[PDB]
Short mmCIF file of C-alpha atoms and ligand atoms in Angstrom, two decimals:
data_model
loop_
_atom_site.label_atom_id
_atom_site.label_comp_id
_atom_site.label_asym_id
_atom_site.label_seq_id
_atom_site.Cartn_x
_atom_site.Cartn_y
_atom_site.Cartn_z
CA UNK A 1 11.25 -21.58 13.29
CA UNK A 2 12.69 -18.25 11.79
CA UNK A 3 11.18 -14.95 10.68
CA UNK A 4 12.99 -13.06 7.76
CA UNK A 5 14.32 -9.60 8.17
CA UNK A 6 11.42 -7.04 7.84
CA UNK A 7 11.00 -5.08 4.66
CA UNK A 8 13.36 -2.12 4.16
CA UNK A 9 12.04 1.17 5.74
CA UNK A 10 15.37 3.11 5.34
CA UNK A 11 17.75 3.43 2.22
CA UNK A 12 19.82 6.69 1.82
CA UNK A 13 20.61 5.46 -1.83
CA UNK A 14 16.71 5.43 -2.80
CA UNK A 15 15.17 8.55 -4.43
CA UNK A 16 12.29 9.61 -2.40
CA UNK A 17 9.94 12.66 -2.12
CA UNK A 18 6.97 14.29 -0.14
CA UNK A 19 3.95 14.70 -2.47
CA UNK A 20 0.41 15.82 -1.40
CA UNK A 21 -0.81 12.39 -2.42
CA UNK A 22 1.84 10.67 -0.08
CA UNK A 23 0.69 13.15 2.69
CA UNK A 24 -3.00 11.98 2.10
CA UNK A 25 -1.68 8.27 2.26
CA UNK A 26 -0.36 9.10 5.80
CA UNK A 27 -2.95 11.50 7.23
CA UNK A 28 -5.99 9.86 5.81
CA UNK A 29 -5.40 6.23 4.48
CA UNK A 30 -2.88 4.95 7.02
CA UNK A 31 -4.56 6.78 9.90
CA UNK A 32 -8.09 5.45 8.94
CA UNK A 33 -6.95 1.73 8.73
CA UNK A 34 -4.58 1.93 11.70
CA UNK A 35 -7.19 2.99 14.22
CA UNK A 36 -9.79 0.18 13.00
CA UNK A 37 -10.74 -2.58 15.40
CA UNK A 38 -9.33 -4.95 12.91
CA UNK A 39 -6.01 -3.38 12.33
CA UNK A 40 -3.98 -5.21 14.97
CA UNK A 41 -3.00 -8.31 12.82
CA UNK A 42 -1.60 -5.87 10.14
CA UNK A 43 0.27 -3.26 12.47
CA UNK A 44 3.55 -5.36 12.32
CA UNK A 45 5.20 -7.98 10.12
CA UNK A 46 3.59 -11.52 10.30
CA UNK A 47 5.25 -13.30 13.31
CA UNK A 48 5.24 -16.87 11.70
CA UNK A 49 7.17 -18.20 14.71
CA UNK A 50 4.64 -16.97 17.48
CA UNK A 51 1.58 -17.75 15.24
CA UNK A 52 2.94 -21.32 14.35
CA UNK A 53 2.82 -20.76 10.59
CA UNK A 54 6.06 -22.48 9.46
CA UNK A 55 4.83 -22.40 5.80
CA UNK A 56 4.05 -18.67 5.77
CA UNK A 57 7.32 -17.31 4.40
CA UNK A 58 7.59 -20.34 2.04
CA UNK A 59 4.31 -19.14 0.36
CA UNK A 60 4.56 -15.33 1.05
CA UNK A 61 7.80 -14.12 -0.69
CA UNK A 62 6.81 -10.34 -0.89
CA UNK A 63 5.61 -9.71 2.84
CA UNK A 64 4.13 -6.33 3.68
CA UNK A 65 2.23 -4.88 6.75
CA UNK A 66 0.94 -1.42 7.88
CA UNK A 67 3.88 -1.20 10.51
CA UNK A 68 6.29 -1.28 7.60
CA UNK A 69 4.01 1.14 5.53
CA UNK A 70 3.77 3.62 8.71
CA UNK A 71 7.55 3.72 9.04
CA UNK A 72 8.06 4.12 5.10
CA UNK A 73 5.51 7.10 5.29
CA UNK A 74 6.95 8.65 8.45
CA UNK A 75 10.61 8.32 6.98
CA UNK A 76 9.35 9.78 3.59
CA UNK A 77 10.82 6.56 1.94
CA UNK A 78 8.54 6.59 -1.04
CA UNK A 79 8.89 8.37 -4.52
CA UNK A 80 5.25 8.36 -5.38
CA UNK A 81 1.69 7.37 -4.18
CA UNK A 82 1.60 4.11 -6.42
CA UNK A 83 4.57 2.73 -4.58
CA UNK A 84 2.63 3.03 -1.20
CA UNK A 85 -0.68 1.94 -2.75
CA UNK A 86 1.25 -1.22 -4.14
CA UNK A 87 2.51 -1.91 -0.48
CA UNK A 88 -1.15 -1.87 0.89
CA UNK A 89 -2.25 -4.15 -2.05
CA UNK A 90 0.53 -6.52 -1.55
CA UNK A 91 -0.53 -6.63 2.32
CA UNK A 92 -4.15 -7.53 1.35
CA UNK A 93 -3.18 -9.95 -1.44
CA UNK A 94 -0.70 -11.92 0.77
CA UNK A 95 -3.53 -12.40 3.39
CA UNK A 96 -5.90 -13.77 0.66
CA UNK A 97 -3.11 -15.94 -0.77
CA UNK A 98 -2.11 -17.57 2.53
CA UNK A 99 -5.68 -17.85 4.21
CA UNK A 100 -9.03 -19.23 2.92
CA UNK A 101 -12.31 -17.45 2.41
CA UNK A 102 -14.50 -16.67 5.57
CA UNK A 103 -11.18 -17.21 7.85
CA UNK A 104 -11.48 -14.34 10.58
CA UNK A 105 -7.99 -12.90 9.34
CA UNK A 106 -9.73 -12.63 5.82
CA UNK A 107 -12.87 -11.02 7.17
CA UNK A 108 -10.43 -8.47 8.91
CA UNK A 109 -8.45 -7.84 5.57
CA UNK A 110 -11.82 -7.49 3.82
CA UNK A 111 -13.07 -4.64 6.26
CA UNK A 112 -9.69 -2.79 6.08
CA UNK A 113 -9.54 -3.17 2.25
CA UNK A 114 -13.23 -1.74 1.93
CA UNK A 115 -12.10 1.40 3.75
CA UNK A 116 -8.82 1.49 1.80
CA UNK A 117 -10.71 1.58 -1.51
CA UNK A 118 -13.17 4.34 -0.27
CA UNK A 119 -10.22 6.60 0.85
CA UNK A 120 -7.94 5.99 -2.28
CA UNK A 121 -11.09 6.69 -4.32
CA UNK A 122 -10.49 10.53 -3.16
CA UNK A 123 -6.69 10.54 -3.52
CA UNK A 124 -6.04 14.17 -4.53
CA UNK A 125 -4.61 15.14 -7.92
CA UNK A 126 -0.76 15.70 -7.60
CA UNK A 127 0.16 19.34 -6.64
C1 LIG B 1 -1.51 -10.59 8.60
C2 LIG B 1 -2.01 -12.05 8.65
O1 LIG B 1 -2.64 -12.55 7.63
N1 LIG B 1 -1.82 -12.76 9.77
C3 LIG B 1 -2.20 -14.13 9.90
C4 LIG B 1 -1.93 -15.04 9.10
F1 LIG B 1 -1.35 -14.84 7.88
C5 LIG B 1 -2.53 -16.32 9.24
C6 LIG B 1 -3.20 -16.69 10.44
C7 LIG B 1 -3.72 -18.05 10.62
O2 LIG B 1 -3.62 -18.65 11.89
N2 LIG B 1 -4.21 -18.69 9.63
C8 LIG B 1 -4.75 -20.04 9.67
C9 LIG B 1 -6.32 -19.98 9.15
C10 LIG B 1 -6.86 -21.43 9.29
C11 LIG B 1 -5.99 -22.40 8.47
O3 LIG B 1 -6.57 -23.59 8.61
C12 LIG B 1 -4.65 -22.43 8.91
C13 LIG B 1 -4.03 -21.15 8.99
C14 LIG B 1 -3.31 -15.69 11.42
C15 LIG B 1 -2.96 -14.39 11.21
O4 LIG B 1 -3.13 -13.37 12.11
C16 LIG B 1 -3.42 -13.77 13.57
C17 LIG B 1 -2.73 -12.66 14.26
C18 LIG B 1 -4.81 -13.96 13.75
C19 LIG B 1 -5.40 -15.05 14.27
C20 LIG B 1 -6.73 -15.18 14.57
C21 LIG B 1 -7.57 -14.30 14.20
C22 LIG B 1 -7.11 -13.09 13.60
C23 LIG B 1 -5.84 -12.97 13.32
#
């Protein structure tokens, strides 16, 4: 069994900025989800080897996780808030695509996604 390389968190070629919205996505959104009792399965890329999910990276071709998002935000990797919001939405969607309703991992994704939606609802206007 083999894991793919993780998503890119560094790329000098890539245009990037700090925006007040991306600052909010780190200080408020990432921080809120990261500290949650259900955060731990999402704090690093899915280890399909250790979890014995040999089909995971046959089904999930756009993997994403909060470990990757944390590194992208800390490295100021993003151009805009929408790129980062897409990463969160990819993470949740992947969980729902691979797993089935009522699975513990899905209940955990649903709890995190509720908070995500509550926080992004108050994403500030761009400065
Ligand atoms: C980020 C993510 O989603 N990870 C993750 C996953 F993709 C799949 C499974 C998993 O075992 N799915 C099975 C459900 C039942 C089906 O019949 C067969 C597949 C577990 C996962 O997380 C572990 C740490 C976990 C394990 C237990 C509780 C919470 C998290």
